[PDB]
Amino acid sequence: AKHPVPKKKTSKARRDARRSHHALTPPTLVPCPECKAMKPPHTVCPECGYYAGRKVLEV
């Protein structure tokens, strides 16, 4: 190869447009049926240690 290089500085506009896909999507959360805390679905509740309506974990 022969060391490709940018021909022009990227403008503020074009730089920021490339980033139009970069915003984070918020974590998806549901209430824990036991202790009402918000937590990711399909995970063991970190607040009370319940899953599937029973205690799984010391928390």
Partner 1 sequence: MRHLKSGRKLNRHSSHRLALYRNQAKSLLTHGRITTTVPKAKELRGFVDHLIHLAKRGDLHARRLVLRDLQDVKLVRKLFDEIAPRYRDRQGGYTRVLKLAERRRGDGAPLALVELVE
Partner RNA sequence: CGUGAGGGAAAGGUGAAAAGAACCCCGGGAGGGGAGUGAAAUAGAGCCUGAAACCGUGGGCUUACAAGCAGUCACGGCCCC
Partner RNA sequence: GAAUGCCGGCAUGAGUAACGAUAAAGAGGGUGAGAAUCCCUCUCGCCGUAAGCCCAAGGGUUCCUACGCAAUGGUCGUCAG
Partner RNA sequence: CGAUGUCGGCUCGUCGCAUCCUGGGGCUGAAGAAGGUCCCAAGGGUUGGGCUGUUCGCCCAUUAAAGCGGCACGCGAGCUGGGUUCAGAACGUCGUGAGACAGUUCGGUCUCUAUCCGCCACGGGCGCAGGAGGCUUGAGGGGGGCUCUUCCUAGUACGAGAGGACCGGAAGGGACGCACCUCUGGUUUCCCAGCUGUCCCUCCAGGGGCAUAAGCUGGGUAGCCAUGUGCGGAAGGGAUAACCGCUGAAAGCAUCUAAGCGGGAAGCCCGCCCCAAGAUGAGGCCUCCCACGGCAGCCGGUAAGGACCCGGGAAGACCACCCGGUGGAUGGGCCGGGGGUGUAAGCGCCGCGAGGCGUUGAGCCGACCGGUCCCAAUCGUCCGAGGUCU
23 lies in the site for RNA, by CB under 7 A: no
Residues 2-41 that bind Mg ion (CB under 5 A): 3, 5, 7, 12-14, 16, 18, 30-31, 40
- Least distance CB 22 / RNA (angstroms): 7
Query: Which residues in the chain precede a discontinuity of more than 2.5 Å between C and N?
Result: none
| Nearest CA among 37, 39, 44 for reference residue 27 | 39
Fill in the per-residue mask, 30 to 59: x = in contact with RNA (CB under 7 A), - = not in contact.
Answer: xx-x------xxxx-------xxx------
Q: What's the CA gap between 1 and 13, in Å, rounded?
A: 30
